[PDB]
Write a protein that binds this ligand. Sequence first.
Ligand SMILES: [K+]
Ligand SMILES: [K+]
Ligand SMILES: [K+]
Ligand SMILES: [K+]
Lengths: 455, 455, 455, 455
Amino acid sequence: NYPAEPFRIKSVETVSMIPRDERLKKMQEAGYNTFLLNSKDIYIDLLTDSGTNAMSDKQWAGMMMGDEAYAGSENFYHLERTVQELFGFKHIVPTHQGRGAENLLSQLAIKPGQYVAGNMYFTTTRYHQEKNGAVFVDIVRDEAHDAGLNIAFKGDIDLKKLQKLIDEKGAENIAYICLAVTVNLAGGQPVSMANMRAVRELTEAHGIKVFYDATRCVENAYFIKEQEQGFENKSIAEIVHEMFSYADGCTMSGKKDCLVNIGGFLCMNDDEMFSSAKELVVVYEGMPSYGGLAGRDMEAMAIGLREAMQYEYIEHRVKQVRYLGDKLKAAGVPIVEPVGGHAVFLDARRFCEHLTQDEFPAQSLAASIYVETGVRSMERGIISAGRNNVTGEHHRPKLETVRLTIPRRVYTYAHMDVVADGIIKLYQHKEDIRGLKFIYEPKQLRFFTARFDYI
Amino acid sequence: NYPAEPFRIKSVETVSMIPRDERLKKMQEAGYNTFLLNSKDIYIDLLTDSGTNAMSDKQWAGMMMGDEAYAGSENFYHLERTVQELFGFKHIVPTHQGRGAENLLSQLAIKPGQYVAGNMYFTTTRYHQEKNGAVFVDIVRDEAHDAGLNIAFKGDIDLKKLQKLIDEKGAENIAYICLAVTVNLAGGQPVSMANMRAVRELTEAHGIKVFYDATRCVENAYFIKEQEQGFENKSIAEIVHEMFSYADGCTMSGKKDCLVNIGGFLCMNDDEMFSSAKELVVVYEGMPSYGGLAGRDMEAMAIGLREAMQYEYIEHRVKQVRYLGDKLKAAGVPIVEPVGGHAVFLDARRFCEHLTQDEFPAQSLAASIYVETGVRSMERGIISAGRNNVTGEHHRPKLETVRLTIPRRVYTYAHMDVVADGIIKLYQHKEDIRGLKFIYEPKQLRFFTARFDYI
Amino acid sequence: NYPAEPFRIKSVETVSMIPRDERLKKMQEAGYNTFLLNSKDIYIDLLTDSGTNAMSDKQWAGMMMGDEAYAGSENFYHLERTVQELFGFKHIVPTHQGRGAENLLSQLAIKPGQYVAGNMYFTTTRYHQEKNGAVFVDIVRDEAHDAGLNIAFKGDIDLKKLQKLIDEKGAENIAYICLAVTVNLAGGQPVSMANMRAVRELTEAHGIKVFYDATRCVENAYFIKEQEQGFENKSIAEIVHEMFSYADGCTMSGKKDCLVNIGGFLCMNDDEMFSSAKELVVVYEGMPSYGGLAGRDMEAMAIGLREAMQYEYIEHRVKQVRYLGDKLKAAGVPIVEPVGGHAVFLDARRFCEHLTQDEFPAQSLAASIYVETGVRSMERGIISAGRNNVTGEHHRPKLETVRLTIPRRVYTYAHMDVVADGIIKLYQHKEDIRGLKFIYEPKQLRFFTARFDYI
Amino acid sequence: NYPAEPFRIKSVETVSMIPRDERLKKMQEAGYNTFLLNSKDIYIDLLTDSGTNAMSDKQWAGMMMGDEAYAGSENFYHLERTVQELFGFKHIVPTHQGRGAENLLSQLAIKPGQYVAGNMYFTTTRYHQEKNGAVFVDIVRDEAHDAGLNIAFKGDIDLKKLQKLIDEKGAENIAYICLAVTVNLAGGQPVSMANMRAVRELTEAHGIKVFYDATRCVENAYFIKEQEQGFENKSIAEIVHEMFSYADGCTMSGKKDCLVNIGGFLCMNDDEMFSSAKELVVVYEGMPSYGGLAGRDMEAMAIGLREAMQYEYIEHRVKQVRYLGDKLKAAGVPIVEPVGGHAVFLDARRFCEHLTQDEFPAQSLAASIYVETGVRSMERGIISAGRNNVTGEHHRPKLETVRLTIPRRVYTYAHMDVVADGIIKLYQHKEDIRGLKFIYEPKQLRFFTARFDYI
Ligand SMILES: [K+]
Ligand SMILES: [K+]
Ligand SMILES: [K+]
Ligand SMILES: [K+]
């Protein structure tokens, strides 16, 4: 069920291994907010899968061959031809990471008052849409909003909803469909090739553009190879190329599936949009020949994207995350299902039914995990949702979760056991977990710097 | 007069060394546009002094210690302490380079219709001011606009013009003063400490904020050290710290004086503005704990800013540029005077007085320079100025220049001799340089991809 | 029982992942000799634990700070201070690896006809002793020669045999005692502190010198910590320092316990011997200030020896090897016992009891293991023993083994499972493993290039 | 006359720039022996051209791709095929540096009592010859021993002398001719292709083997291209390959002309000698598949040897050393002539005619140079010659020199001016240089650690 790592360890990152009593002190110094912990004090850091990937020896060799010319860099040429080959789009503009590409796309592709419809949303992606005057419309299938429902390709768009938006608003009033692979907010859920095809077919008929939010497109391609009938003789590369054939362009974060610590890019087929993109990138990112990246980083990202196409690599990536989910589920620990490509989400509401949402069960569970194991996880619940600035009440999200987000190629199954075993042990005495109260609350971005104490 | 390099060569960048006939074919394939040349075909690349710097062994050691954590990275803390120590500001927000810091500043500090006044301007800096509703006012001393005038501290603000603006417009209507060090548009001209102090004193009396465009603040500190009475017993670090003591914050490009290939940051003293800056950075750049940079780049920038404080390093940096300018001037080659900190600008109007501006003397001179020496330079004249959209006429700039822009720690005096001797030989038969005409002209950003042929 | 890796993965070594049929073709191209396989064709390479270690980010930072000066390098001074601090010797002479230190020691310390007595022996170590006129005497306890006997500190010297040698030969006729930690030939067996102390006390009483063959001294320190009464409150560093307090000097391979890919050194207390060692090092290795090493490697070895002192690192190192041995033993696979610090040795005589030694059971078993798993192992049996030049008969060794040798910080428990599960499956049908016969036999060093076919 | 560096600076090595009064203190703390100075206290280190070369970006990329397998490393394969291509020998055995290859060759190729004849000698090379029972015979042309004589190809063998050795001793009593390129002891003097051919022709007729001491064979190839008629249309590679076609094998130090900081190798054509070489390398260096080098170093050396074949690189290398010599000679400073490929040697006897050899003019001149400029040079005179252990008198060498030895790709012409200008300034008041006396003298290797004071 679970393959060994399809690589060896070339170099290691040293860790302190501080014991429980010392971790409790660090957690207190951090006001029980994992976002305030110091990296040097953490054994296993599952705060994010963004930008913390372990690069290969070949990428590090590329890092030594940075050609830092303002224009005409060999590294820009390599990235451009690699993305043209693997994603199949005509034009590429580098950006420093994914949200830089989102800024450009939304300024280029939206008229004020138009709709952008997508399969759920991501914070930066949707901000740039709305900042530019779009109204967001969620067209994901209804099941994706049910966190416990175990169905395949849970990230699929509901074609009926797309049809109704077209019927009610008119095609000329829809800027574009923003189709994300995988779907982050539903827990990293994949989208089927059948769905990408059907969405292309209906939008094309109406003259409507489609742009992917493509940050975990390789994880997605793996779910298609594993679970979609007809794809068993296809390579990961073949699946990735067909996926993008159903789009007019994409925004990409190299920090996720391109196996790098920084980097992103915007792709499109249209020449006029490319010309406009080049004049705007200069303002926000840099020249079209580097887009806010060192030459060595264009090189690392070109090499990493190609490494991601290796079947054994992405199979192990997804099955390692699956192992953690399987082990938690086998012990009765409540999690979002099915497990996604990049993370396991604990259902903190169910984990701590002895607590009210106003006692911050997700924030507290995350604190408990670090103290007991040296593992950092992210609060994705009531705290991150923020306070209603009109009423003064918490926004109360339906999802009250702790995200165990897994960087690529950094951890082993033994690290996964450290994580699972500690959570399972906490779950056996789940009632002992204490509620939290604010002792310091910022007006904005409160998850980042808020401090708490036990009730 | 001209010191030796205060460092040894640790590693080299290999070059092809292709001869004149082969360079002529490359120039023709690039349509006589140096922006279109491949980096792999160039011996000495003086297109820019941005982000092409040679890092040290110590910076490379730091590159291997990237702590890629989303929050709490050791590299963030090191950058933050370093900038607090050396610049003297309370708060720091990393950005991927300088224009990312400008975007944040202009959104936070400007109400539509307010004025932003500075000592001349830079393209991205003024764009971000104008995009947010500011009206730009030039308050540099009149002398700065006379490219032939040899005077010290030519970058100084005219206190009388600053004063007139306040009287005629009202303090409440001025968003801030944007004081740049050095002043790029005048050829890299320094600003005196006496000027920085007088501006602080006047603005403070009216409650007006001052923010520095600080990209070449260390080169600026060197000029003060060399030429301003009273600064002979002061270190570069003491001068830099006093400079920033007369500001409310700054936008910085590490890609210039911090000796790195990517990186920048925003500094401010005000607690409220810091909180707002953290909200905005997340949508354009990244979390406040990395700001669109890999941990290793925060580390390389922290180390490089400290290396920039070494007296012998910056003396050599500035005197290398001076060597090139002195050698050209002694042969009668027309240049912008006095030579600034980072570049030498050739007056192509005067160099090719036999051509009209319509025949693109700067574009043609930069082409000749590549063919004859393997040196790439930047057109900064009528081509880069663009065409008037409304009328369809060229914008005809007063400055018709070729910029010989010098990366830090990359080249030797022998390389400077290749550059100078080739230009001097061309000058001796300047009448023979041919005019250019468009064969392909983009509607936007024409300097980046336009192609030409000889008349 | 089995701790998780006390480090994260910083970078990876990419592997091909070729399937069984393709591995069989590679094995055939290598003439069924694992020594002849290409590294690029191997998934898990257990040929050696020498010089294949994964370095840390901190060691890689040191690799960028190589001070390549012929004398007075900062890296030399750092190595020298570190070894003085941790090993407690007065003088240090770097060598390119351990056998370079052995060459110097044996030339300096042996008069022709004198005896060198030790706890078993290693090939290079004993060669250098014999080449200089020493007669080797084995003074290990008899139990060490019983490969099946499970006892602690199996590497211990028999004080009664040491005593007999002194009585029968005379102290003046003993050049030195060569005490090895751990003892490689018995499978990596540790020596107790009590034994080291008793040997020092006896030799000192007769004026006999003791020099340690120290290549796996840290693994040895771990066993003492785990199993010798009285050492529970002692650090690894305290144990290492006390170990070397009972010697006059040592030969060390950094390629083993100092966590590097190249490097070694010679230590001694005696001023006169140090002066002589400096004269000799210049002709074989290099100046005493670098000893056949790049400055960056002196740095990486100084850093790596200090990292080896971390309790969690060495506990994990030794327990990973133990995991592999435990899993094999539980399935009934015959191995040398108890499992040592660095490797597991399969008893191929017992594994392939259906074959005669003349049919090369160890060579054949190592071939099968590669075909079935992509794991490379070393023949340490009749092939490596060589042929008798005088008679032309095989040397027929008591030990007919396949060595599963484990590089430090390179592999995971999942990799250990690939190794074990493949061997266990082979064991279940052991009768089917075929004998080998030579098709090409070199006159010298036959194990390195001999080729075979199945009988 | 003097080409610019045919490369750019990729990274730099930071230096302290300590002033004169501080340098005087360091020199005193070092007992006026430059060999005792710390690297961190030196601005320009010309102690040696061995192993201090600046590697390229491509070599550093290779450094990240180290394949550290005990056998079958991709890096060993690359080195082997590179040396086979460029030097043209059948077999290669890596060694950690040149003197490791010398140890093997001399043990394999000499019977006790035989002669080895060569064009002068090098210390390690000759030691290994004699240790194995050879009698050394100098067969260089008589002119090479006249240090002031300006003739081309001053390193040539005197064919008449070779003939007389053959006539008087008999061919069967000559182990081999050891032909060195360039000839170090005469100041780095080249050998002509005509001479290498004639030596091959005479030895072949008598059945006598020829092995090169090849450490600066690329410098040598450059002198042939520049000065030997018939070689002007030949590439450096073509000249190098023909050179080696006149030999039976070679010993090579990568630390000189292969542009690396560590590494060497032994080459031969004979199969039986190759087999014997492989059994002996194991004892002293390591397996024939790595020979005492990390895989990354076999890779760097393979890449560096190929870089050395670039005409512009080796032309600049030799002409940079020539510039220093020309500038010194133009000021009347006495030097060994003609200037060689890798160093300038000052004639300290003539520089300080006011001193006797017993007052150590070379040791003192070297001290003066460091104090006045921050430049380290090596004593190659009476001190290095050592004391006669029978008589107690100094060995009094004819040559009393200070070696300014130039690492490859590390320094600029401005560093050369620092060196020359300081020596010239010292030369104008040459009479002020004070004699030295021993205050501490070791019995052996006295140049390395002896301490002095002014008379
Ligand atoms: K990162
Ligand atoms: K750059
Ligand atoms: K190795
Ligand atoms: K070296």
